[PDB]
């Protein structure tokens, strides 16, 4: 809140980022880029990557596979709650029935990311 700078909030590459709505209504290149970015979309170059973020439940990662098109060829989603729920067989051993709900609650699981 104290170091928020003034400047651009979007990357100025117009072949990836859509233009502003005033620019689109006044220049021909912006309208062409608006038309194409909202129908075909940008083309991602062929390749692969895995990128992860410290999500509040752990490591959330996407494995993106690109062939070169405007659509992902393969998009694997890695969720931390999927790995955390796999441990319930070794974590609940020696516990009682009233501790299962405590274990499930402390693993912090949401089944949207578990069940993609």
């Amino acid at each position: 809140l104290n170091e928020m700078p003034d400047g651009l909030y979007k990357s100025p590459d117009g072949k990836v980022c859509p233009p502003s709505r005033s620019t689109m209504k006044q220049s021909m290149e912006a309208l062409i880029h608006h038309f194409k970015l909202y129908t075909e979309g940008f083309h991602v170059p062929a390749g692969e990557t895995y990128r992860a973020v410290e999500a509040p439940k752990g490591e959330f990662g996407v494995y993106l596979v690109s062939r070169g098109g405007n659509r992902p060829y393969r998009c694997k989603i890695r969720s931390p709650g999927y790995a955390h729920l796999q441990m319930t067989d070794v974590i609940s051993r020696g516990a009682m029935l009233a501790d299962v709900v405590t274990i499930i609650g402390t693993l912090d699981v949401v089944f949207g990311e578990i069940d993609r």
């Binding site: 083309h43 990557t49 494995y63």
Partner: protein
């Protein structure tokens, strides 16, 4: 079990210079020279750990996936203790249409690596359940989604799809909406599966430019 809390002060650094230089530059050549029979192909590319670096991708045969993963877990310079996921990618144009992909993370030296195995539909891949305990559910999901059989698994059964579901949905030749749909029947008093009918069929928009150069 590594990366224990040791420094009680705030650390303004990531890794050491010599080990980061070794991991970001020499790790591909190191793995190739130490265990050459395990490696059949290598790619050094845009670095899973950060946007600023490069990181290796190792191709191996299914006959040597387990010894290579044990070496990558236990060798003193490559301590890849965490297996993040196991998945597959379908390439219907190839003779072996599947690529099974393993991502690893080294908490000791802030590194990551990727390991690939190419198989077709009827060649089994050895399980990594004994090497990594998370390999169980990921191999179950890969069998569910693609039909890759993992030999030596304790209980290879489907984990995600419906109970009677035959068919592997993430293949390229499987339809997006499938073959069957579900409704309640008042006469049979049961929820019943029926062949697919759509009120509005899916509209496929073919946007791709005939001047575009990047399509591979």
């Amino acid at each position: 079990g590594y990366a224990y809390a040791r420094k009680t002060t705030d650390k303004d650094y990531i890794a050491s210079e010599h080990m980061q230089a070794f991991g970001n530059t020499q790790l591909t050549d190191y793995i190739i020279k130490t265990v050459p029979k395990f490696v059949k192909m290598a790619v050094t590319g845009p670095a899973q750990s950060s946007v600023l670096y490069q990181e290796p991708t190792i191709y191996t045969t299914p006959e040597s996936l387990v010894p290579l993963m044990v070496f990558l877990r236990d060798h003193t310079n490559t301590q890849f203790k965490c297996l993040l996921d196991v998945t597959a990618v379908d390439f219907p144009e190839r003779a072996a249409r599947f690529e099974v992909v393993y991502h690893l993370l080294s908490p000791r030296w802030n590194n990551r690596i990727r390991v690939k195995v190419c198989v077709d539909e009827v060649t089994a891949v050895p399980t990594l359940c004994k090497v990594f305990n998370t390999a169980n559910w990921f191999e179950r999901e890969t069998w569910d989604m693609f039909g890759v059989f993992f030999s030596g698994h304790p209980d290879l059964r489907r984990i995600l799809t419906d109970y009677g579901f035959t068919g592997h949905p993430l293949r390229k030749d499987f339809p997006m909406t499938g073959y069957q749909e579900v409704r309640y029947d008042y006469g049979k008093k049961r929820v019943v599966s029926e062949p697919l009918e759509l009120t509005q069929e899916f509209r496929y928009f073919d946007f791709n430019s005939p001047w575009e150069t990047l399509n591979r």
